[PDB]
Structures are given as structure tokens and as C-alpha cells.
Amino acid sequence: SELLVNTKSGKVMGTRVPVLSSHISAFLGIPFAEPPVGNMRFRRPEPKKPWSGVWNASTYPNNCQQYVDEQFPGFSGSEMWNPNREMSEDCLYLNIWVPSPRPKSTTVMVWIYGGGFYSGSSTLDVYNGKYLAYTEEVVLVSLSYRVGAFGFLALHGSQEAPGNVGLLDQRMALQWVHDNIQFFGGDPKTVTIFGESAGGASVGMHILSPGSRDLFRRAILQSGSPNCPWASVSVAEGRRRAVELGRNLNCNLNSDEELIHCLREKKPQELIDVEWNVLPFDSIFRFSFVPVIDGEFFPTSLESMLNSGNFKKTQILLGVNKDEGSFFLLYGAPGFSKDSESKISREDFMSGVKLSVPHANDLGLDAVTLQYTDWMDDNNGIKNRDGLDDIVGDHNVICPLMHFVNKYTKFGNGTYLYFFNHRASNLVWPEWMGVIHGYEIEFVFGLPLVKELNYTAEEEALSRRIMHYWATFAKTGNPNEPHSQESKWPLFTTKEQKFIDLNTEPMKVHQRLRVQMCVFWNQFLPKLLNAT
Amino acid sequence: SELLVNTKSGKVMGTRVPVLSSHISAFLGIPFAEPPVGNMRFRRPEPKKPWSGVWNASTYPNNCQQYVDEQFPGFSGSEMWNPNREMSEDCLYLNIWVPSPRPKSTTVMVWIYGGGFYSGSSTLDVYNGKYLAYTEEVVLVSLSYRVGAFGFLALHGSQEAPGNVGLLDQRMALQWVHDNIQFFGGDPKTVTIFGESAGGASVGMHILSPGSRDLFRRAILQSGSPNCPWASVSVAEGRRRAVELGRNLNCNLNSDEELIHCLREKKPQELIDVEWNVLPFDSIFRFSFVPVIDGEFFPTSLESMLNSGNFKKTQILLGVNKDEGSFFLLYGAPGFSKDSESKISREDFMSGVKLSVPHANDLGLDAVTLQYTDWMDDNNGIKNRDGLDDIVGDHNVICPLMHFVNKYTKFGNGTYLYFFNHRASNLVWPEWMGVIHGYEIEFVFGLPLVKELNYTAEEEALSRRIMHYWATFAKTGNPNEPHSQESKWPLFTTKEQKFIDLNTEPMKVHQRLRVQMCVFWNQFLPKLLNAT
């Protein structure tokens, strides 16, 4: 009865799941779009046709087709991010966790997974929504969206492969939540969208895009922002990559209709096998098929939108991890496995700089090199490793986010900024990698509350603190409970630019998160590359 | 009799002067050139015609015509650098201090004064050679040379005003020493030239110039080097400045002969009154009439000469002071007078950067600003002052010298590098100015040995140490006394790049003198300006 819900698309039947010696309701694999298959591959999503009968929503759905990571077969640290369900183009489903008994109209949080817009699943163990839903009494939704060429092949002008359809998949799940979440006890007027990495970029993209703004109340962005250098391409570059993808499969390249028709007849794994070939350079933290600045989903360039205040004005909470770049270098820079601690020579540093800033001319490479080299000690393998670590994280995550946060805060209605710098006591990655891209997620989702996962008592308390900040922000637009005695997370303002650390120590307030390097990345280096 | 010397130019009569608790011989105002007056203005020097009778060399000669500093009238700190004798175009004389009794063939040191190539005198109290000559038993010579337009007006292709004649004055005094110093007890095979600021650039220029190399044995350069950005100009820029000097004086500009003839009719002070007007930019640490890269004194560009080893190969000793920039900012950046300790707003920082790197485009100015700004704390008046202080000293003095050191050491026969960072206990300048441009000279010349000047006894010991380093280097090409128990001043090498501090504390060896900023000034910013 609790598990039986009549929606505007049909009746659904959920399942009762255990969580921390109690139970809650889960509705898994609810369809929100027509399967984007056959002649609908690369097309805008269509609403799911209402069904008769009872949709069985007790099991996780398929994951979208995607490149599977085989760098470290069997290693939990990488396997925890891979699809744990069968892959299929039939993947546009959402999941809902509902406190029990069902609330009347409580706060809703909607998760958007990351994965560079080429990978990701709503069904990962680390996205299990039951702990956050139970502990904070929120309705927790996780959506899905098409990735890779299936989500972001962009032949602008064509209505058959317009680009950005994976962003429209997300918007369609948000529309479904808007129309139906009230029947699961959720308040459609108090929906917070949150996501990490490409999920965080996505969240920012919905803040910008006029067509998405009314489908949510406020936003949380983790280690990602819409202006990230890897998160979008021009319509020309998207067109170039789509054609290059056809060339890699010996397709007729004479017309969009011919190219698209050829691509629609390849098996999914055939597109995935060639996906990495269309990139313009050898590079790390670059992805083949990503959103396009199309003049439709994004009316103008992201910078002009940010400059003019052309975005949803609300409250945002956002932040970064200390070592965003480490796993990208381990995976993509060969020098990082010549040494057990990944100390690297000066030659490998220079090579890595080229791989990490692939768009820079030779003068920009020197500028990057000079900014991150200790010329008193340039053969120090540790300083070389750490310098290139910072380059990757600053360029791709931290400084784009700081640019976004300063532009947004001029027009928005409240900004809260964090710096997550706790290394989990049970981490399986080597210590030099630090606080890795993605490893705040398990704290946000409450995993340290599970005794058998072997976190410390301090880490359970940190997880509880973070979940409550997140939910209280979702509920009120402010992560703090005023009237409490706890330390207060202060607003980020244009003038004082305050942020807090998130770790196991008592709260610290700082100002101007990595301002020195982000002036280099956000102001000086683009001016240098614009000059030459 | 000891005071009577027969030279190849005629007999000279010197004077016995007291030094400390003893006495020494001095031969003051010996002419080495025909007075460059009348039609000889701007012309290459001519050897002094031998005289009959006895030249009375018992008093200091006139100083050359020059801009007199009146910024702080009566203030000892600035007046100690102004002419203390009458100014005259009849100024090509030299001074010699000779130990008593006369040595048979002792080490010779020849002093070349600085002053931006637009000022300077051989007769300043701080250049009194008697202490060094007495204490170290060397024959000490100080020369003079024409400064300003008189010495460096350059209309290339003209034989009436060819440029570089002030350097040819220096060379002709060196030739006089070569021909005659044996008659004063000096060894002409063991002559060291040394000078500070423009005198140090000059010393460097005789190392480069083939017509000078055989007139000295080894070289000492203090706070100056031949490649400094203020120390030379192209022939085109020298010609532009000379023409602009005529324009300022309503001269006929139709030809070199007419321009020169007009210029030769003006009183010296009329040239000096308009000297600063020919500079191409508003600037500090830039001077109007300086050596020209002419293809004769300098056969090719300084950089190509340095790169190919086209220079005298011998031993050099050289170094810099801690705060080369400070008095240039006091004099020329009005922000340094708004506040007692010269705290500097951000606006005045940015203006000073423009004044200090006047040749840079906007991208280069931003590069400089970024490199010297603490963006966590950009309104700190102390940090802004110190940052602009370091900009001026690094750009104009320290990093040019480091570039010269590294090029020279690839081909030379022994390099010794120092960093002078003692602030005299009796300094009359405010504390923020630190170790000022020129204030190591008084230690080199042994003024702390004079009790009436209220130096500390530890500063006397430091002066004695430096005089002994300098003279021992002049005598042997190594500042260290062999078979000694003191710590050794190490050779500077391409690989280890060692230098010492000069101060009252025990000797410390360091490596890579200001390498971080000098990579910026010597490698990156030039590449940036060349490319953009």
C-alpha cells in the first residue's frame, strides 16, 4: 500500500529495503522517457507513453551504454564506478527512496551522476540513496541520462542529432519529478538538484538554460561546474568530432542524413570502440562527446550568460576536493607508474604539462611550467609530481568552479563554498593520490554509517555533518540550523569570499580559495592564449 | 722625489697625503686626453699631447658636465653623489694612489665610476682610493669619462658624433695605465678594472669589446652588467634620441653635420636641461645617452657575443646588493612620498610597474604584476612597496647580472659571485630602503676604517674582509688566500651556481641567486614580448 503509487504515467509498485536496523521504501527503475532506440538514437527524448497495469519497480534498471574502465580489472577502487547492471540503450529510468511512513510533502533531492559525460550509472553502490533518505527524511531521486555519442553527438542544424540530448534526458527526469513527486510524498516546489563532476557541470548547465530553470528550487555542485574546459565544445568542434566518428566507421560523410543513418546502424559497442579517436589532441581530462553551446539549450556563450546574469537566481552550495587531478595522471601519464610513489622526472613533468593543457601554444606551456616549477629544486620528483597534480586539478576543476562561484554570487541569492580535504581511513588508492576526485561522494551518501564498511567514528560523524548540511540546505537554502550552538558555515560573498573546510577537525573559515593560481588560470593564461 | 715621476706623457708632481696613522703618495688630476672641448665635443678622445715641465698633480681635477641631483638639497645621502669639484668639459683626468715607499711592481686596480652614464665623478669622498691602496698595498687608479650627451650622443655613420666616446675615454685611460703605471710601481700585466652600476656595465663592456681586452688582466663588476636593459641602445634609437635632442634645442635637423654643429654651439647646461626629454617612455631606471650597439666597439649584439664566447676569457668577481631598486622608486614613483614608510596602494603599485617595465605591452605588464602580487593580500601597502622594490632591482640589476654570470662562466676561467646584504649602522636613508644601490662602495673603499665616520667595529672588519677579497682577487684571480684557515669563497660553476653573502655574520654559501624571478625576467618575459 505504502509501496503502491499512482502516477501521471501509470501505477508503480516499489519494495521495502533495510537500512540501518530500520526500513524505507524504494521505487527502482521507473521509466521517464521512451527507450531512445532504433531511429530514436541521438534524438531528443520523448515522454514515456503511459502504461496500463503495475510497473514492477523493485529492481535497478539497466545502465546506459558506455566505455567500461578496465585499467585495473577487479580493483574495487576503479570497479566501484563501472556499470553494475547490464548496459543497454534502453536506460532512461529513475530511482526514488522514500522515508517510511511516507511524508506528506518533504524536501526532494535529485542526484545527477558524473563520469565525464561518457560514463556513469545511477545504480552504483556509492549512490545508494537509502542512507540519506532515511537519516535526513528526504525523498531522494537518482536520474539517468545518455552518455557518450548516444547522449552528445552534435550535428547542429540537424533535428535528428542536434546535440545535448543527454542534458534533455536529465531535464525530462526533472519534469517527471515536477509532475509526480508529490505522489511519493515529495514537495515539487522544494527540489534540489545535486551532482558530482560531470553531474556538477550538469547542475550548473540547468541553472543557465532557460528551459530547465523552473524544474528545481536550488542546486548543489560537487567538483564540477558548467564552464569547465572539458564540459562543452563549440558547434563546429562537435560537428568535426561527429564527422570524424563516421570516418572511423567508414560511413558516408556526404550529408548529416547519411552520416546519422550510418551511425544508427552500428551496434553500441561499435561506437564506443572508436569514441576516443575523435579528440583533437592527446590529452587527459578531455572527453569526446559533451554538451554543445548550441544557441538553444544555451542561448549564448557561457561567459556572456554569467557576465549578464542570464541564469536562475537562487541559493547554491558547491565545492571541491583537495586532489582532483591525481587519478587522471595515474591513468593517463605514463611517468606516474615508473615509481611506487609516482615521483616523476623533469622530462615527464614537461610531457604531462603538454597532455594536461592540450589547447595551449608553446608560450602558454612555458607559462604553466614556470608557474608550477620550483626552480631552486626542479629535479625533485615529489615536487614535480605535486606540481602536475595541482595543474590538472586547478585547470579542470578548482579554478573553473571559482570562476563560476564569483560570477554567480554577483546575482544569486546565497552561496556556500566548501573545500573537502579528508582522506578516508579505508581508502584503497595509494596515499600520494590524496583526496581523490569523487571520494567526498561516499560521505554525502552516508556510507560511513555502515559499521561493516570500516570507517572510523570520526568519519561517521563527518558523514552525518555533511548529510545534514546538504539536506538542511536543500530544505531551507542555508546549510546551517540557526538557533543551534554549532559553528556556522558563512555565506560566500563577493567581498570576503569565505569558505569552510570539510574534514574531521573543528570548522575553519578561510577566504579566496586558491586565488593565486586561479588568477593565473582564469585571467592571465586566457589573455596570453588570446594574444598569440 | 717619491712624488716626482717621469711618464711617457711628461713629468708629474704628486703630493703626500695622510691615511689613517700613516701617509701615502697621491697623483691627482693627471690628464690622459686632449680636452674634448669646442670642435672636439662628441668626438672620440685624442691622446694628451706630451707636456714640457712638471705637471702639478696635487689637487683633484674638474668633474665632467652632468645633471646635478637637487631632489634633497643639502641631504648628505644624495649630495655625496654630486660633483664636489667644478664641472667642465675639460674633465678627462685620472688619479693614482701609490703606497709609500713606492712598490716595485704591485697589483693595479682601476676604478670606473657609475651614475647611469649621465653622471658620476672620480673625486667623490666615497671613491677616495687611499685606504684601499694603503691597506692592501695596491696601486689604485680612478679614471673619468664623459657622461650624458657629451659622452654618448650617437649619430652612427658620422665621425663627428659616432657614439660610445665615453667608453673610448675609459679605454684611453686604460691605455695610459698600460703604458705608464710601471713608473708608479704598478704592474701593467696585473691590472683589474672594477666599477659599480654603469661602471660595472662599463667593465663588462671592455670584457666584450675587442679593442679593450688587452688593456687589463681581470674584472670586478658591482651591481651592474653590460647587458642591463638601461645600459645600451640600438643605433636607430641612439639616432632618434640625438635628433630629438636637436629638436628640443631648435637645431637644424637636415643632416648630421648641421645638427652636430648646432649642438656644439650650445652651452653644456643647455644640453643637460633637455637631456631627459628624449626618452621614449615615462620610466624609471632609464637614461637618455648610453652606449650604442654599433658594430665597432661591439661587433655584434651583446647576446650573440655572450652566446659565442666572443669576449675576454679570464676571472671575474661580481655581485649585487639586496635592495637595488629602492632609491629609484623614491625618486621617480610619487607613491613613495605619500606615506612615511612608503606603503603603496594597489593603484600606485600598478603605475610603478608601468614606469618600471616601460617597454612591455599590456600582456607583459600583467605577467609582471601576477609574478609579484600576493593575491591573498593585494591591498597590503608593505607587500606592494616591497614587490615593486623587487621588480626594479630584479629587472634592472640582479637578473641581467645573473644572465651575464651564467653566459660568461661557460667560457671563462673563474667566476666568484656575491650578494651584499649589510645595512650600514650609520645610514641616513630610511630603513625600508634596505641595502641601497651603491652602498657597498664605502666598504670596498675602506671608509669604515675611519673612526670619525661612526661605523661599528664589526663593519670595519667587514670592510677589511672585502678589501682583502677584492685585492687578493686582483692579485691572483682568486679572492681566497691559499693556505688560510678561513672559510673559502667557492667558485661559481654552471652546475652548482654557488655564491656567498657579504655581511657581518659568518660566511654562508647559497646556490642559484634569485633563480625563480630571474627565470621570469631572463627567459619567460623576453619570450612573451618577442612573441606578442
Ligand SMILES: O=C(Nc1cc(COCc2cn(CCNC3=c4ccccc4=NC4CCCCC34)nn2)ccn1)Nc1cccc2c1[C@H]1CCCCN1C2=O
Ligand atoms: O584515449 C583515451 N582517453 C581516455 C580517457 C579516460 C579518462 O581517464 C580518466 C577517467 C576515468 N574515468 C572513469 C573512472 N571513474 C571514476 C574514478 C575512477 C578512479 C578514481 C576516481 C574516480 N572518480 C570518478 C568520479 C567520477 C566518476 C568517475 C570517476 N573517468 N575519467 C578514460 C578512457 N580513455 N583512452 C584510451 C583510448 C585508447 C586506449 C586507451 C585509452 C585509455 C583508457 C584508460 C587509460 C588507458 N587507456 C588505453 O589504453
Ligand SMILES: O=C(Nc1cc(COCc2cn(CCNC3=c4ccccc4=NC4CCCCC34)nn2)ccn1)Nc1cccc2c1[C@H]1CCCCN1C2=O
Ligand atoms: O625622468 C625620468 N628619470 C629621471 C631620473 C632622475 C634621476 O633618478 C634616478 C637616479 C638618480 N641618480 C643620481 C643619484 N646618485 C646615486 C644615488 C643617490 C641616492 C641613493 C643611492 C645612489 N646610488 C648611486 C649609485 C650610483 C651612483 C649614483 C648613485 N642616479 N639615478 C632624474 C631626472 N629624471 N624618467 C622619466 C622620464 C619621463 C617621464 C617620467 C620619468 C619619471 C621620473 C620622474 C617622475 C615619474 N616619471 C615620469 O613621468
Ligand SMILES: *[C@@H]1O[C@H](CO)[C@@H](O)[C@H](O)[C@H]1NC(C)=O
Ligand atoms: C517484481 O520483481 C521482483 C524481482 O524480479 C520479484 O521478486 C517480484 O515478485 C516481482 N513482482 C511481480 C512480478 O509482481
Ligand SMILES: *[C@@H]1O[C@H](CO)[C@@H](O)[C@H](O)[C@H]1NC(C)=O
Ligand atoms: C535573498 O533574497 C531575498 C528576497 O529578495 C533578500 O531579502 C535576501 O537579502 C537575499 N539574500 C541573499 C543572501 O542574497
Ligand SMILES: *[C@@H]1O[C@H](CO)[C@@H](O)[C@H](O)[C@H]1NC(C)=O
Ligand atoms: C700645485 O697646485 C696647488 C693648487 O693650486 C697649489 O696650492 C700648489 O702650491 C701647487 N704646487 C706647485 C705649483 O708646485
Ligand SMILES: *[C@@H]1O[C@H](CO)[C@@H](O)[C@H](O)[C@H]1NC(C)=O
Ligand atoms: C683556468 O685555466 C687553466 C689553464 O687552462 C686551467 O687549468 C684551469 O682549470 C682553469 N680554471 C677555471 C676555473 O676555469
Ligand SMILES: [Cl-]
Ligand atoms: Cl543497433
Ligand SMILES: [Cl-]
Ligand atoms: Cl599529496
Ligand SMILES: [Cl-]
Ligand atoms: Cl561506525
Ligand SMILES: [Cl-]
Ligand atoms: Cl567537530
Ligand SMILES: [Cl-]
Ligand atoms: Cl660652449
